[PDB]
Amino acid sequence: AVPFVEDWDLVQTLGEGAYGEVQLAVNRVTEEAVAVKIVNIKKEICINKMLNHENVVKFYGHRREGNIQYLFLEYCSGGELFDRIEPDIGMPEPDAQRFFHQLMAGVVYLHGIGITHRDIKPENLLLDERDNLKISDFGLATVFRYNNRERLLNKMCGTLPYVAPELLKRREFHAEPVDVWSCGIVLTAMLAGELPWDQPSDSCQEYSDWKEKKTYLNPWKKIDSAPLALLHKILVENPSARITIPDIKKDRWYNKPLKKGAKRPRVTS
Template identity: 30%
Template structure:
């Protein structure tokens, strides 16, 4: 006999809300554990693209979620009106909340979070998946304060080995989206590296590298890609951190680092601890 969601879990309070659904805290009486239940309303899916996201996200997460820094899907339930994903519970602040509260981070603090984020992104890319919406709101923390990359609703398969394909379509979020996406070109998984670089820039300085008074102005600044390090914000940031940022927020995709190359950069390897600079 099929067991429904309510047979297996007690649905508790709302802890988050997105474009298509609501996230609740839930409890499993059988195991005694708490989880998150992401409930997606099918009535909000306007077109075939939205419907593809409904099918794609649980498949992506199942494909990727053996990694410690990616949200894990434990069970999936579906009825005529809703899709329910039972996932890791990350009920604390997300990275956006922490940045808003702290303003900026020391290099050690930033490296601790950033390295986990890049490990998750590198795993996605090894598995042939581009997230395509890397932003602080999608960087969550579990009860052990471990980074969990979430929300794969915009993710896309690009394949591995000889089966690799270019991606297209404008997806992402102002401030974080890569210029080649906005220019309507085909692009590859390095769009995630650009976005992660923007996050690191903000963590170290407290300000975004490209900004404007509207989404259009932000997009124009991103497409120009004129990366600067204002002395007021970067006075105490090491040259190696700036070197990493230049190689991630690089408009020339062929020169932009891959996720695995980022993880091998000296600043990341040393956890933000730099030798004294002369």
Template identity: 30%
Template sequence: PTSETGHIDLGGAFSEVVLAEEKGTQRLVAIKCIPKKALEGKENNIENEIAVLHRIKHTNIVSLEDIFESTSHLYLVMQLVSGGELFDRIVEKGFYTERDASQLIHQILDAVKYLHDMGIVHRDLKPENLLYYSMDEDSKIMISDFGLSKIEDTGSVMSTACGTPGYVAPEVLAQKPYSKAVDCWSIGVISYILLCGYPPFYDENDAKLFEQILKAEYEFDSPYWDDISDSAKDFICHLIEKDFMKRYTTDKALQHPWICGDTALDKNIHESVSAQIKKNFAKSKWKQAFNATAVVRHMRRLQLGTSLESPSQITPTSPCHAHNKPSTVPF
């Protein structure tokens, strides 16, 4: 019996997610119900997602447990993750520290290293894809949504326009060949947000946003970063690194003292961070589904030889960005 439904965007196809119970064991699972009509012409997307999910078995990655097919639908039986979304949990906490953020990023790095070791690049890491396994206080974090992931073929070059603008690496926007390093950039952006509650790159004008990202222009603004350790800032600088050849890999990031040592501070930063998250990642803004159209528009603009400074014809790229100078933005 289904008791809860919601909608997600999966590889461009609209699908429904239902909560279901396995009759024999009474175990709860999530089932993605994908109408085959919605897949016409997109079969490769879903086949790719299934091929990837089938290979993945990691404690911090939502697993695909079974597949069923009817004449009209494809049903993916997924591990149920019931602990809620990353930002909601941080806001709900009364106490939150750098060490908490470090432990979250450690789990994400561990999972992404596992993927990279298998030759898989997620390509769309963002807070919305990070869910808690259960409501337990010490619940692990889980990576979900492999709609954009791709298994790296030996010698192949990934250069598709994908990802969410605020989290996308400069080499993607510059239309250069890219690889696993794009995930490490995204982890850097997520780490930044976890420590202040707003993203490193923001502009309502797409072209200006892309310019910031291409130059890797961001700051550790006062007062939001005043109480954050130099070690945390150093860790972020190695991931939000413009040159992907110099950017830390998951292996290097896992060896950084902020992750594996004791440099992450125990000072409570909950009040400041949760206030910024509530202001900048309000449910009504960031919960909405959005796609990579802004990135695609940017690519077209590049191909047409127009300037990056040219005014964007579209309003905000995504509803979930905040300003990197929160105090100056009207909300």
């Protein structure tokens, strides 16, 4: 229709991953911003075409140019959740709760359509212009439910400090408690500004201390009793005993009023 509307200028590097790079693209005509992932890949596109939710990075389409694959994705101007976490501090509890609510909304959605992300961490949770959280990077994602039949997972996927202990100890495991666990590690990072362990193994002193309930130690001593009680339900070694998302939604801290709405303009007299 309108000339030049299909032209995008690649203006800045957003990250240089394993596959390739992510560029910020700006439309020559409209100045609309999109993230272009320049490159597992066939599955990532297939999974992305299934996604439509306010807390999931939108997929606009893809184009193949010989050996190069281009994925046009929602640009999140707020960057990574990772950058909002102050090292050894975390962030204000109300901000962490709001991001946690948004993360649960995204995960409920994905699980509802039978998709597991398998690599939830603050580097993959992006923020838009209004600080709304969006789950990104479906490179490691997979279908765990098809035709209402659950498929047990067996592939070692994810990032060690975020990974659930059953991935390291069992041949097969249910997909959903694995994503719930990584969400608990994200919550810990938001509230304490540190990861509790290198990996959830009995060989990890920090992991053993957590199972022994030594909450007078870091990162736990920095976390208020209400969010810490939720973490005691999420970070449970037995995935069958671990809290499910419907129950996280019933948690006392999850439902605690803490955060005021966005700073809206106001005047007096």
